[PDB]
Amino acid sequence: TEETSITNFYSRAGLVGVVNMPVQGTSNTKGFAKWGIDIMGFVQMRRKLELMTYMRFSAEFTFVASTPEGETTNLILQYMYAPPGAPLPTRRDSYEWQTSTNPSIISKMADPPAQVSVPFLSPASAYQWFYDGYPTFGKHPIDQDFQYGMCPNNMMGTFCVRMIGGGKPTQSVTIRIYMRLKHIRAWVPRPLRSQNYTMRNYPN
Amino acid sequence: TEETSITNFYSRAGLVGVVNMPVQGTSNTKGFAKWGIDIMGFVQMRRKLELMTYMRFSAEFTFVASTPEGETTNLILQYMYAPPGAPLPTRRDSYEWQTSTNPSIISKMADPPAQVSVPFLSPASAYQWFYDGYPTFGKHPIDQDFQYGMCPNNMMGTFCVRMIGGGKPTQSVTIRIYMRLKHIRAWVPRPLRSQNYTMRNYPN
Amino acid sequence: SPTAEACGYSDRVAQLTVGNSTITTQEAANVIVAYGEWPQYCPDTDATAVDKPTRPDVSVNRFYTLDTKDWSSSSKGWYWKFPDILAETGVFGQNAQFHFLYRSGFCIHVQCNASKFHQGALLVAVLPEYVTGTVSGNTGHENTHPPYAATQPGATGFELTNPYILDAGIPLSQLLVCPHQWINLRTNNCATIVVPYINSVPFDSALNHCNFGLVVIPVSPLGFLQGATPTIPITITVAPMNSEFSGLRQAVTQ
Amino acid sequence: SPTAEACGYSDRVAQLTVGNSTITTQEAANVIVAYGEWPQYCPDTDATAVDKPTRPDVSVNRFYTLDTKDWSSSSKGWYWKFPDILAETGVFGQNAQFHFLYRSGFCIHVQCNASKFHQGALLVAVLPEYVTGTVSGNTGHENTHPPYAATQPGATGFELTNPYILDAGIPLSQLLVCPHQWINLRTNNCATIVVPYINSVPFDSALNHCNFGLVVIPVSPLGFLQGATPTIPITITVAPMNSEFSGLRQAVTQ
Amino acid sequence: SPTAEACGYSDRVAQLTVGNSTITTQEAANVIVAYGEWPQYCPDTDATAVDKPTRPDVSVNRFYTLDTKDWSSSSKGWYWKFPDILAETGVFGQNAQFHFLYRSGFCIHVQCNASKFHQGALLVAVLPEYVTGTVSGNTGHENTHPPYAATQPGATGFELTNPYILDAGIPLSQLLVCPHQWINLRTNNCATIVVPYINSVPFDSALNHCNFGLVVIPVSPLGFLQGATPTIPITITVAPMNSEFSGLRQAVTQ
Amino acid sequence: RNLLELCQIDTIMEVNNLTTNEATPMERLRIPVQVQTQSGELCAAFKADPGLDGPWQSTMVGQLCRYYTQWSGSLKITFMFTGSFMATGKMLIAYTPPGGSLPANRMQAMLGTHVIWDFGLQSSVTLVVPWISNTHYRSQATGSFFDYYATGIVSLWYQTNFVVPIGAPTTAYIVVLGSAQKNFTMRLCRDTSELTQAAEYQ
Amino acid sequence: RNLLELCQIDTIMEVNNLTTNEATPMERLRIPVQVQTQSGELCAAFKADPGLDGPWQSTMVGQLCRYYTQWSGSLKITFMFTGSFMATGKMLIAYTPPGGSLPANRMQAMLGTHVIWDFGLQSSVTLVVPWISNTHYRSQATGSFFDYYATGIVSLWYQTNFVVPIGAPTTAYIVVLGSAQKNFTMRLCRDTSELTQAAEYQ
């Protein structure tokens, strides 16, 4: 019926993934976040996406942030994903954060969560989970073997979020990214995989 | 006149039911709520619904929460009803709360109350209060007799609301769910029942 | 037809015919059909089953005098569960078990001997989804639920603990809303009713489910002089109307 | 054509022809083509390259009996990587290296000697994007990745560590979804398959990339009496279908 | 169709369908229908009863695997009484008892496992009005008559005292006249027959009466090498065709 | 496309619910057949259950089914005779509607919808399990008796005993396949219990 | 459908407002009739009141009425002679508009709208109570004199004394039924006092 159909299946949204940065923020005292593209590590969301290799996507995701408590506090954040191409900000001062080209949105914590959509970037027709081969040419040393999984096409740039201040933050924040899928066309579904955990990031 | 007519009668809305969870929250220190579907236990609202067995429903209900004082405080909550089918979250960490399929809404306490509508789920044509028979087949032991009332069709999944945080909440919240009925068509009304209280949950 | 004043004749006299069963009552009140409906075969759209139903029309549809009950001047009313009673009897009941996915309606005839005075009219009604409720110790704490025997007495009937309550929240008086006719039997005699359907599911196994049950409880105390015959019997006969079965497989008593 | 009951004849008998190579099997099951597609030449729109491809049709397209493998009653299945196998052979492989920007499909024929009983059917399937996954020490901590030899064994095949897993998350049973046919060889004989494309990029060097690999693993243990001939060989021959090359320049084994 | 020389194909392969029962035999001989007749519903003119018959078509008409019997290399044949066997089974048998005025025909399927040699063909035939006759002490003086169990064994079968005689005057050899087919099972496999009617009375209670009985007795001794599997099972399934009942009233086992 | 279509492609219920069998699935798959008593033997008994039951659960249908609170539809099952070609045998397969107990015998099973297997040149036979339900949709999840929940039961038996050629081995194997009928539905898609991780992958 | 329709189906005012009678309703229902003085006897007096009065209140009409702040409309009442068929008797039934006191006698009642009961073969007789109000709508709730509130009064009397056949018992019973007229209205639906619980069911 309606629910069974693909759109309903996809339409459901879940947490893409979240990170928490403590106020003390040993991890980031500066509290800059340079985030990997990889949704992929999170199993649950990813697998579903994996399920249909080929999709034409317009995707909207929402940003919500809170402390580990979930308490909100007033901070204003700036948001960016430069690309993978761009330099990634070293620190609070970091040059990149002033970003000409690289897109940024500024919203207050107080401000209601912001939602945006992103195009299907990949240079490849699609992002396919499985990759067979090496991004690189040459003899494959044992050490090299790490390479095997990677598919360069399905690789995206990092995200940067920094609380704006010379000083260090009073309060913590969590990325708590939510993604929802727009109406989807998908092709050539592939079976779900559950495996032992070879390692992350994993082609699975 | 207008008021007498059914729609007016139904249109009136009341508290479906509420629960309060203390900050200390002995009940839920975690403060997770896994809520039963049963509106039914609450007499007043339910009886009216009982009054017309058959309805085609679109129903909207609103969420408001406050402490037992009614004081509001800033927390951000996540809302879910997985289905009855889904696992129900053990704890704060609980896996389920990251919910792919199961619907969730996130709103701040600060954020204005959210209203949503729900379809007439039941696999049965309608949910009828009275059930005659047993959901189960077999000899009916005295102990078994508890079963008698239950009507599996008019059974719905639980709700989960959890304050979002690893830690335990500063502040309490109350479910304070309000439901309003949309324009209704109803059939084969049944008389109101007031009885001694056999027990809850009760078929009555 | 009749208004309060208006009264015709030969309304009272009626005959009922069913498969090789007939009942006639000289005195009667016009038959009442529930909710202005008459029984019908479940629609194609309606039926989920995708299993071709079987309707033994003739054998299935007949009056069965399942039981006769005696009366007391005042007695607790007792309830006849529809499904069990038919099941208990055969062939129909036997057929049901194999056939177990079962749904049907029926026409009901109850006859009693008549006395002139016939005070202490008894009211009979069928209520769909009759659900019993216990005292629960009368504390209300007890939270106990009714016995199996009570719930489906097996057409023994079930004497009503408290008639007004009807052992359910519903007040007795309101009960009138559901279709019924009362037998003072001064007014009328053996009543005739045909029962239209409320079926939640167009087809049920219905072994478990009871479409509804019949309750017979006198509103009024009977009164007679000593001389008059003390015993006022009541008998019930019913013929199920359209019945269909699926779930051919093995028959269970349950 | 056939439904479960329906069976024609001469479905089993088939001949395959390719450039100066022919295979016939008396016994066969109707050929399955993947995803209802047949191989084709990459479209102009599709092709980025802007380098005119070369298709040696004839030489390229032929059955090659790259290797024959013996069988064990139970043996680990092993995987044939498509790209390497062709490459290893020549001219085609040799052509590939120079030609290195390469894409193609192929038709696959696998033949075995037949025994009447032919229990212990073996299932062969090709899965696109076959990716291996390691135990990683079975701690899971180890986070180790598969050997080069393992990944592209060079058409030695690769014996499967754990068949159900297939050394990948995918459960074996689900594998059926991808097109395949199984050889009990009681049922059938040398299978024929033609492989339609899933190609991420319409043209790849494809030296690095493998279109897919073939896995041959018996679902069932073989069983025979002692007298019966112990050795049940399997051989594979394939002819690549439309192949096109670009990247004329120097050939690398890699 | 075939003459002695002529042989077609797919005569042997056949499927039989009945109400939710199917049997297929790869190997078969063309079905024989008795006396060039096929079963039919008793005509209005024919039927005395003036009681409307009931035909549960579907439930009544189905293959029942009432019993499976093992074989001996040589074994006495045993007879299946038609009426009892159906009666024993239910619903059909159960229905019969209530329904007791009963008449029907049926299609019969008997299946066995096949061995290549399948020597020792067994001949099965149904003879209407099979009447047993006793030795009567072999003096002939005794004038004794057969046991109840013997006459209607209740689908246990009845092993034949002396096959040639068939415990009746009729010589065995002549038996061929009545329609039958033999299973060497080398030649054929599970036979199919549909039995047309000889009914003395267009409707009978037929509880007492048996339309006919089936006898299965090998003309030939089975022979096999020791190695070959010693056990050659036979199974019988039958589906009664048009069956009608009257005499609704109480069911008696008898 | 639709998940159900995926379901259609292939789901196989576990022949036997054994840890060992499940863990090493091939073992589970085989259902042994031997020369036996011609009848009265029970090849095996299976449960209808939606995939709350192990065999379905393991299957793709089960996995998807788990996702969906309710499942409705009819299932197709296939059986194949792997066992020796020369050897022949007949078996009865029966399906029984809910409300009965497990057939617990060949005859009983037969009363319910049944089919007979010649098994011969046609390797495989397909059982069909009709959708029969009081309710249009049944819950995927059972575990507690609900009339709506419980699909029913299935069983296998020996219509005839196994007979084998001298050459042919006494024993034989049968494999079971499962499929989804064209009309399959599930409702209110939600999460799946099946996959979780205790600890963050991160 | 509409509640009023439900009201239409059947509401019966308590014949007598007694705790005992109310608690055991059958007792209440009977209104005794006996051989009496032919006239001057008061069978009973009833109050119009909207269901603030007990008898209506208990009724469905009362229950709904309680919900509605105001009720308007006319009520139908029926009486039946349960008492011995052979015995005959005539009674007068009277309805009186508001503003008077209770009739307190047969004659007085008669002045107001009245009907006479032969009671015979026709078991039941129907009184009708017309809607008469200064205001289109009256409040459901009374309890304090408001002209708008108070419907009026009704009474029963003996047009003739009960006469009984020797066989027939001296006493006889009459039962009262109540109904709602086609035109019934209530306004501003709100809560009902009637059902509450001291403690949470939960």
Helix-strand layout with pairing:
The structure is cut from a larger assembly and holds two copies of chain A (about 200 residues), three copies of chain C (about 250 residues) and two copies of chain F (about 200 residues).
Chain A: H1 6-11, E1 14-17, E2 20-21, E3 33-35, H2 43-51, E4 52-56, E5 59-63, E6 76-80, E7 104-108, E8 115-118, E9 159-163, E10 173-174, E11 177-181, E12 185-189
Antiparallel strand pairs in A: 1-11, 2-10, 3-9, 4-12, 5-8, 5-11, 6-7, 6-9
Chain C: E1 14-18, E2 21-25, E3 32-33, H1 57-60, E4 64-69, E5 78-81, H2 82-88, H3 92-98, E6 101-112, E7 122-128, H4 148-151, E8 180-183, E9 191-195, E10 212-218, E11 234-246
Parallel strand pairs in C: 3-9
Antiparallel strand pairs in C: 1-2, 4-11, 5-10, 6-9, 6-11, 7-8, 7-10
Chain F: H1 3-9, H2 19-23, H3 25-29, E1 31-33, E2 42-47, H4 54-58, H5 60-67, E3 68-81, E4 91-96, H6 106-111, E5 114-117, E6 124-129, E7 138-139, E8 153-157, E9 172-189
Antiparallel strand pairs in F: 1-9, 2-8, 3-6, 3-7, 3-9, 4-5, 4-8
GO molecular function (chains C, D, E): structural molecule activity
GO cellular component, one term (chains C, D, E): host cell
Keywords (chains C, D, E): Capsid protein, Host-virus interaction, Viral attachment to host cell, Virion, Virus entry into host cell
